[PDB]
Amino acid sequence: NYTVDTLNLGEFITESGEVIDNLRLRYEHVGYHGQPLVVVCHALTGNHLTYGTDDYPGWWREIIDGGYIPIHDYQFLTFDVIGSPFGSSSPLNDPHFPKKLTLRDIVRANERGIQALGYDKINILIGGSLGGMQAMELLYNQQFEVDKAIILAATSRTSSYSRAFNEIARQAIHLGGKEGLSIARQLGFLTYRSSKSYDERFTPDEVVAYQQHQGNKFKEHFDLNCYLTLLDVLDSHNIDRGRTDVTHVFKNLETKVLTMGFIDDLLYPDDQVRALGERFKYHRHFFVPDNVGHDGFLLNFSTWAPNLYHFLNLKHFKRKDPAFLYK
Fold first, then answer.
1. Which residue ranges form the domains of the chain, and what is each CATH number?
2. N or C, fewer C-beta in 10 Å, the chain?
3. Distance between terminal CA atoms of the chain?
């Protein structure tokens, strides 16, 4: 079954003390009543349409069709974050949408949306990289018992690199409106090393021309106010803020965590995503040796999905860890 609809969940108060009278969460559900739940947390530029249609396939469709997380064994739920322009409460929908939205807000709304629909356990929690940020917060609130977690291209807090990125983008938008959106979009190419893409796409002038083309599309289809909102969301990410016990919590969580980090990435360095994994009781890391950009980690699934599948297929009872002093 395939369902796309909108919850109405009443009053929501952000961290900043601002109010939405009727919190709306657009979502996509897919699968059968009783199956293991997988919750996907989408990334800044994505949305709830995880599986999508046959004619309009979804962000994750290829990964699901390829059988890495197969439809036949799983049930899928995904919310469009608040502030996104694709159906949930946002500046595009709500003329009194809060000025200061944080990531912790986005999460706390989605957990209420997960509970609105009667779920209790989450077998697989998955996201990168804003998705991964959602994921880690969610694990901290501990409103759910969650068996398996995959966190891709995200860390414990927004870096100075990312604030610089986000500020540079913010400025361009002030100066140029829609035109600033192109730059913001183009800006992403500067955050990572492209490998034999340099080979295949010779074509400078033709990369630049492609950049321009992607930027121009983006500036016509993604609402501007919402984008600025989501830039604050990123700037607000830090699991440790106002908190003392984050690691402690994570160290007594039974959840099996996989962290994935990508090669030569300045926005989300492998170094630091691995170190976030290692904060948990049960943790593991995969280093993925190709990178078409944080924004397109779905596009290069060939290089990482099989390790996901490997991870998903633990069905060895948890070992209590002093057995690992070896080494």
1. 1-327 (3.40.50.1820)
2. C
3. 47
DSSP H stretches of helix in 85-177: 103-116, 130-141, 160-176
For 251, the token pair is 């160290």
207 contacts: CB under 8 Å, gap ≥ 6 = 189, 201
Q: State the method.
A: X-ray
* Resolution (Å) of this entry: 2.5
| Pair 131, 152: CB distance under 8 Å | yes
Using the structure block, give the residue that is written with the tokens 């060895």: 316
* Longest Cα–Cα distance in the chain: 59
* 190: CB partners within 8 A, 6+ apart: none
Query: Do 45 and 39 touch, CB atoms closer than 8 A?
Result: no
Chain centroid to CA 230: how far? Answer: 12
